[PDB]
């Protein structure tokens, strides 16, 4: 009910239907979505937590305006937060079951690669990549860490598979997935070996793949900008 | 503005322990408690979810977040890691002449809190100026996204920079530890000026571990000090 | 002449012709290499600095014995030393000329690769990889750092290009990731991101350890193609 | 080795380089060096070569040796390398683990170092700290149980200015240096704590930061106390 309200409202913000700087109010938003006030209230609050809306001082909400600096900083925060989770898992240790689970996801991700450099199941990688980053966040067994890492990924343009959309299935991106999969293996290896410094460094570097993919799209493939939701609304971008 | 007296009153009742961890809150029962209308109560319950004091229940309603010792240790870790990011980015990107003069002035004022003997420290003066230093450090790299994320990491009562420095916890062991902490403040600024991001990050992370060291000293050696420290009311 | 004596002496140690525990003396070594004593003296001293020989009290050298732990530790030290050079270059800054030179090496390394990994210049990569690691060591402009980094890379089994016949499908695929690391080190140095520059340079040295561990577990016939590796007991 | 003519020449020749008797930039040849030490040609050749391996001399392209010259930049870079090498030993000890006996030994040195401090900020046994500080850094290098790593930290700490207690000589016992020892002792405690807790990242970061104290103390002598330069037996090698 409330979840269905979040999806539609998020879609209207990211499409540019509700532009940056636009003021949103409980009743006018409920009329727009043709949904009851209770789910709409949950949706507006959830999208504030997610970072798409800001609260206005006298009540109501405002659609946030993002710059390139915001995208780069969001990717940085996510990498730094995932690096913390990986380091703490290596320092504290991981349970037999949790390790078996994440190692199974890495093995499934290996099945997305073939003989030629381009032979990669892009859609299969993107779905399993989300699972790997979820399991990595929970690895150290801390709810506080899991919540803070998940919040850092909820943030705009900070999702692990955000720069891997189905329609951005290009050669240059498929070749870069082999290096990314080697990073997943290295994070788990470092955690097993109790090498916190390595686990953190690899997780931070791994997040920077998103920034490289973004920079590739601006300089070499600008038609791919519209494939990332909301990215074409960032006026700054170039 | 900003949720009014409703958000303030409801936050005060959660932090005092009046509304304990695990307690379920609903629109109507909360409105009866605050003797306010439904609209300002709905804003308050939503705002405190965004702030991280409440969690949403799957079938509607809210639940007061419960915190344990592990949560305090992890919050201090996240704060250090976030401050370390701000310090590293300030060193990598560079800092404006005005912003550097401001932070360096706070460090100079903090130096005036120290005397001849190891215990000769103005504890209340350090705590107030320490809050300013950490605020200024968060804004140094010039990024709003970083400043917001660092301030959020510092927002819980026990994750605050001066949280483990309350006026009544003015003990000898804690005054001796402030000299090392002040040397860390100087080192963070020096590393930023020198464009040494790695050092700036490492010092900021280590500096935050002082809070954990001071917390661990209480649990083991002075448990009567637990009640005096804010945030430790949300703990069991 | 002295450099020629070092190559010939190093080759006999790494082939196992001069086994570990063997005692070497100026005269007997000069008779063996059929070279004058002065270049042989330089060679014996240079190989002590490099870590292949140990000095005996009273003169004379002894050929060192190496274990897998020695290889693992050498690679660790090299990565840590290269990470220092990369971090200091990012923190201090690099001159326009030095940055153009190292970036030209990276561009030449790209020409070792095509569209596919089927035809990748393995011998070409190894030669240019040595140049990249030489320039990276000198980037921060410190002679002290350059000397300590080159020493850490002279060390046994620590060399950056640690294999003409060992040219398999897998080791060719791993050179693409290694080249992306070279690009990332330079990018981090340009961007003044010391932390990143250090982390990438450390992780880059670990590729050697990963490739060593692959041969032992999956391709032991490739052990004889690595110089001196066939002498270690594991 | 000290009893051999070869070993005796290394001790005497090292002493003349470190005293400044043989200054930086001085070309040393087999003959001139042998006349100086009044020793035969063969032990001199061993001596000259051993000090090149040691890093005190450099080889000249057309034959012969040159006394290696050191500048302020070289001292700063040497302290950086030592911190980076000690940080590696501390990180590897935390990652691998340390035996019960080795931990009890280093923790005993930390406890002995705590006995060097009193009530006032200046109340510090400077000579007692310097001797025990050498033991702590010795014990720290060996902690991970790797011989190559121990040797590598040993080498990084071998130049007279790259030594852990080099910037703590008996004659440089000043107020501004005694106050800095309290922070340094807290870092010794933090390195051991990080190793026990298996926190390699922290162990490395603290060991690197700890080494920067030596740079801070050096910079203080140059900018504020230049009369202290000559009384540090280790800064004699410095040109400018
Ligand atoms: Zn991933
Ligand atoms: Zn502080
Ligand atoms: Zn390379
Ligand atoms: Zn020390």
User: How far away is chain C from the Cα of A222, in angstroms, using its nearest Cα?
Assistant: 22
Q: Which residues of C216-228 are buried (b: 16+ CB within 10 A; e: fewer)?
A: eeeeeebbebbbb
- Cβ-Cβ pairs closer than 8 A, B with C, add up to 23
Q: CA–CA distance from A2 to each of B40, B52, D207 (Å)?
A: 20, 19, 52
What are the structure tokens assigned to A111, written together? 């099945």
Contact C12, C44 (CB under 8 A): no
Q: What are phi and psi of D56, to 5 degrees?
A: -85, -25
* E strand intervals along chain A: 23-24, 53-55, 61-63
Whole-angstrom Cα distance, residue D200 to residue D191? 9
CB under 5 Å of ion ligand 2: residues = B 130
Classified as helix, coil or strand, A164 is coil
Contact D129, D112 (CB under 8 A): no
**Which of B179, B186, B200, B217 has the highest number of chain D CBs within 10 A, making it the mutation to test binding with D?**
B179
Q: Does C65 touch chain D (CB under 8 A)?
A: no
| Chain A residues near residue B85 by CB distance under 8 angstroms | 76-77, 80
Q: Are D206 and B203 within 8 A, CB to CB? A: no
Q: Are B145 and A41 within 8 A, CB to CB? A: no
Q: In D, residues 116-135, which contact B (CB 8 Å cutoff)? A: 119-121
Q: CA–CA distance from A63 to each of A45, A52, A70, A219, B145 (Å)?
A: 12, 6, 15, 28, 16
Reported residue count of chain C is 234
Contact B135, B83 (CB under 8 A): no
Q: How far is the CA of B18 from the centre of ligand 2 (A)?
A: 31
For the CA of C207, the nearest ligand = 3
Q: How far is the CA of D136 from the centre of ligand 4 (A)?
A: 7
Contact C61, C36 (CB under 8 A): no
- Nearest-CA residue of chain C relative to B194? C91
DSSP state letters, D25-83: T-EE-HHHHHHHHT--HHHHHHHHHHHHHTTSEEE-TTSSEEEPPB-HHHHHHHHHHHH
Pairing between β-strand D57-59 and β-strand C61-63 as defined by DSSP bridges: unpaired
- Nearest-CA residue of chain C relative to A180? C177
> What angle, 0 to 180 degrees and rounded to 10, lies between the N-to-C axes of helices C37-49 and C26-33?
110
What are the structure tokens assigned to A198, written together? 């390595």
- Locate all alpha helices (DSSP H) within D115-179, ordered by sequence: 126-142, 147-156, 175-178
Among A131, A151, A153, smallest CA distance to A143 is for: A151
Q: Are B116 and D119 within 8 A, CB to CB? A: no
Classified as helix, coil or strand, B133 is helix
* DSSP code of residue A74: H
Contact A213, A163 (CB under 8 A): yes
Whole-angstrom Cα distance, residue D129 to residue D178? 10
Contact B183, D184 (CB under 8 A): no
| Chain B residues near residue A45 by CB distance under 8 angstroms | 46, 49-50
Q: How far is the CA of D122 from the centre of ligand 2 (A)?
A: 24
- The DSSP H or E segment spanning B101 is helix B97-111
Q: Does D73 touch chain C (CB under 8 A)?
A: yes
- The DSSP H or E segment spanning D210 is helix D200-223
Q: How far is the CA of C202 from the centre of ligand 4 (A)?
A: 26
User: How far away is chain D from the Cα of C205, in angstroms, using its nearest Cα?
Assistant: 15
Whole-angstrom Cα distance, residue D205 to residue D216? 17
Whole-angstrom Cα distance, residue C195 to residue C90? 9
Q: CA–CA distance from C83 to each of A23, A103, C189, D186 (Å)?
A: 49, 29, 11, 27
Whole-angstrom Cα distance, residue B9 to residue B88? 38
Among D206, D181, D183, smallest CA distance to D194 is for: D206
Torsional class of D81: left (φ above 0), alpha (ψ -120 to 50), beta (otherwise): alpha
Whole-angstrom Cα distance, residue D3 to residue D1? 5
Question: Residues 6 or more apart from B170 whose CB is under 8 A from it?
Answer: B123, B124
Q: Does B92 touch chain C (CB under 8 A)?
A: yes
DSSP state letters, chain C: -HHHHHHHHHHHHHHTSS-TT-EE-HHHHHHHHT--HHHHHHHHHHHHHTTSEEEPTTS-EEEPP-BHHHHHHHHHHHHHHHHHHHHHHHHH---HHHHHHHHHHHHHHHTT--SSSSS--HHHHHHHHHHHHHHHHHTT--HHHHHHHHHHHHSTTT-TT---S---HHHHHHHHHHHHHHHHHHHHHHTT-HHHHHHHHHHHHHHHHHHHHHHHHT-GGGGGGSTTGGGSB-
Going B211 to B217 to B223 to B228, the CA torsion angle's sign is negative
Q: What are phi and psi of A156, to 5 degrees?
A: -60, 125
**Which of C176, C178, C181, C207 has the highest number of chain A CBs within 10 A, making it the mutation to test binding with A?**
C176
User: How far away is chain B from the Cα of D58, in angstroms, using its nearest Cα?
Assistant: 32
Binding positions of B are 130, 134, 185, 207
Q: CA–CA distance from A116 to each of A183, B69, C72 (Å)?
A: 20, 51, 32
Pairing between β-strand D27-28 and β-strand D65-67 as defined by DSSP bridges: antiparallel
What are the structure tokens assigned to C106, written together? 């990276």
Classified as helix, coil or strand, A61 is strand
Whole-angstrom Cα distance, residue A113 to residue A174? 10
DSSP state letters, C155-217: STTT-TT---S---HHHHHHHHHHHHHHHHHHHHHHTT-HHHHHHHHHHHHHHHHHHHHHHHH
Contact D126, D170 (CB under 8 A): yes
| Chain B residues near residue D121 by CB distance under 8 angstroms | 116-118, 179
Say which residue the tokens 């590696």 belong to: D88
Contact C216, C153 (CB under 8 A): no
Question: Residues 6 or more apart from D8 whose CB is under 8 A from it?
Answer: D2, D39, D43
Binding positions of B for Zn(2+) are 130, 134, 185, 207
Q: What are phi and psi of B196, to 5 degrees?
A: -100, 85
In the complex, which subunits touch A with 3 or more CB pairs below 8 angstroms?
B, C, D
- To 10 degrees, the CA torsion angle through D136, D141, D144, D150? -150
The long-range contacts involving A185-189, CB below 8 angstroms and separated by at least 24 positions, are: A185/A106, A186/C203, A187/A86, A187/A136, A188/A99, A188/A102, A188/A103, A188/A106
Contact B153, B78 (CB under 8 A): yes
Q: CA–CA distance from A154 to each of A40, A149, B208, D182, D232 (Å)?
A: 19, 9, 26, 44, 57
* DSSP code of residue B123: H
Q: What are phi and psi of C53, to 5 degrees?
A: -125, 155
Q: What are phi and psi of D67, to 5 degrees?
A: -65, 120
Contact C122, C164 (CB under 8 A): yes
Please tell me the number of Cα atoms within 13 Å of C18 on its side-chain side: 22
> What angle, 0 to 180 degrees and rounded to 10, lies between the N-to-C axes of helices D180-196 and D72-96?
30
Q: Are B205 and D205 within 8 A, CB to CB? A: yes
Q: In C, residues 15-54, which contact D (CB 8 Å cutoff)? A: 38, 41-42, 45, 48-49
Contact C68, C215 (CB under 8 A): no
Whole-angstrom Cα distance, residue D26 to residue D57? 10
Contact C78, C141 (CB under 8 A): no
- Nearest-CA residue of chain A relative to B58? A2
Name residue C190's beta-bridge partners: none
| Percent of chain D that is helix, strand, coil (3-state, to 5) | 65, 5, 30
Classified as helix, coil or strand, A63 is strand
Is D210 annotated in a binding site? The answer is: yes
The resolution in angstroms reads 2.3
Please tell me the number of Cα atoms within 13 Å of D228 on its side-chain side: 20
Whole-angstrom Cα distance, residue D99 to residue D116? 27
For the CA of B162, the nearest ligand = 2
Q: Are C200 and A198 within 8 A, CB to CB? A: no
Of D121, D186, D209, the CB nearest to B202: D209
For the CA of D134, the nearest ligand = 4
Q: Does C55 touch chain D (CB under 8 A)?
A: yes
Whole-angstrom Cα distance, residue D36 to residue D43? 13
Whole-angstrom Cα distance, residue C223 to residue C216? 7
In the complex, which subunits touch D with 3 or more CB pairs below 8 angstroms?
A, B, C
Pairing between β-strand D65-67 and β-strand D57-59 as defined by DSSP bridges: antiparallel
Whole-angstrom Cα distance, residue B194 to residue B207? 19
Domains of chain B: 4-64 (1.10.10.10), 69-228 (1.20.120.530)
C98 by Cβ neighbours in 10 Å (0-12 / 13-18 / 19+) ranks as: middle
Q: Does C180 touch chain A (CB under 8 A)?
A: yes
Contact D202, D194 (CB under 8 A): yes
- Rg of chain A, C-alpha, whole Å: 19
Q: How far is the CA of A173 from the centre of ligand 1 (A)?
A: 13
Q: How far is the CA of B132 from the centre of ligand 2 (A)?
A: 9
What are the structure tokens assigned to A8, written together? 């539609």
Q: Angle at Cα C225 formed by Cα C220 and Cα C228, nearest 5°?
A: 95
Q: Are D52 and C55 within 8 A, CB to CB? A: no
Whole-angstrom Cα distance, residue C135 to residue C182? 12
Among A24, A59, A27, A23, smallest CA distance to B4 is for: A59
Q: How far is the CA of C63 from the centre of ligand 4 (A)?
A: 36
Of C87, C195, C198, the CB nearest to B88: C195
A126 by Cβ neighbours in 10 Å (0-12 / 13-18 / 19+) ranks as: buried
- Cβ-Cβ pairs closer than 8 A, B with D, add up to 31
Of C117, C200, C206, the CB nearest to A205: C200
| Chain D residues near residue A193 by CB distance under 8 angstroms | 95
**Which of C86, C194, C197 has the highest number of chain B CBs within 10 A, making it the mutation to test binding with B?**
C194
User: How far away is chain C from the Cα of D81, in angstroms, using its nearest Cα?
Assistant: 8
Q: CA–CA distance from D230 to each of D169, D222, D227, D235 (Å)?
A: 11, 11, 7, 7
Say which residue the tokens 């703990």 belong to: B235
The long-range contacts involving D59-65, CB below 8 angstroms and separated by at least 24 positions, are: D59/C42, D60/D27, D63/C38, D64/D27, D64/D28, D64/D29, D64/D30, D65/D27, D65/D28, D65/D29
Contact B70, A144 (CB under 8 A): yes
Q: What are phi and psi of D200, to 5 degrees?
A: -60, -40
Reported residue count of chain B is 236
Q: In A, residues 198-217, which contact B (CB 8 Å cutoff)? A: none
C100 by Cβ neighbours in 10 Å (0-12 / 13-18 / 19+) ranks as: exposed
**Which of A86, A91, A190, A199 has the highest number of chain D CBs within 10 A, making it the mutation to test binding with D?**
A91
Q: Which residues of A218-230 are buried (b: 16+ CB within 10 A; e: fewer)?
A: eeeeeebbebbbb
* DSSP code of residue A231: G
Question: Residues 6 or more apart from D126 whose CB is under 8 A from it?
Answer: D168, D170, D173, D177, D178, D181
User: How far away is chain B from the Cα of D119, in angstroms, using its nearest Cα?
Assistant: 7
Q: Are B202 and D182 within 8 A, CB to CB? A: no
Q: Are A73 and B43 within 8 A, CB to CB? A: no
In the complex, which subunits touch B with 3 or more CB pairs below 8 angstroms?
A, C, D
- The DSSP H or E segment spanning B146 is helix B144-153
């Amino acid at each position: 009910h409330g979840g269905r309200a979040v999806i539609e409202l998020r879609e209207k913000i990211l499409s540019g239907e509700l532009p940056g700087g636009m003021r949103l109010f409980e009743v006018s938003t409920a009329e727009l979505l043709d949904i009851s006030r209770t789910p709409v209230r949950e949706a507006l609050s959830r999208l504030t937590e997610e970072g798409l809306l800001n609260r206005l001082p006298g009540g109501g909400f405002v659609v946030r305006r993002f710059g390139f600096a915001d995208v780069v900083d969001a990717i940085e925060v996510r990498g730094v937060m995932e690096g913390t989770a990986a380091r703490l898992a290596a320092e504290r240790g991981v349970s037999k079951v949790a390790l078996e689970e994440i190692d199974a996801t890495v093995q499934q991700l290996d099945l997305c690669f073939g003989d030629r450099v381009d032979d990669v199941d892009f859609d299969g990688y993107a779905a399993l990549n989300r699972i790997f980053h979820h399991q990595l966040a929970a690895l150290c067994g801390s709810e506080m860490i899991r919540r803070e890492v998940e919040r850092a990924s909820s943030l705009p343009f900070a999702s692990p598979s955000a720069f891997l959309p189905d329609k951005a299935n290009i050669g240059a991106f498929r070749r870069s997935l082999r290096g990314a999969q080697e990073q997943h293996k290295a994070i788990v290896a470092a955690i097993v070996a109790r090498e916190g410094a390595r686990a953190e460094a690899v997780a931070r570097e791994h997040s920077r793949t998103a920034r490289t993919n973004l920079e590739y799209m601006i300089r070499e493939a600008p038609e791919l900008i519209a494939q990332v939701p909301g990215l074409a609304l960032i006026s700054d971008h170039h």
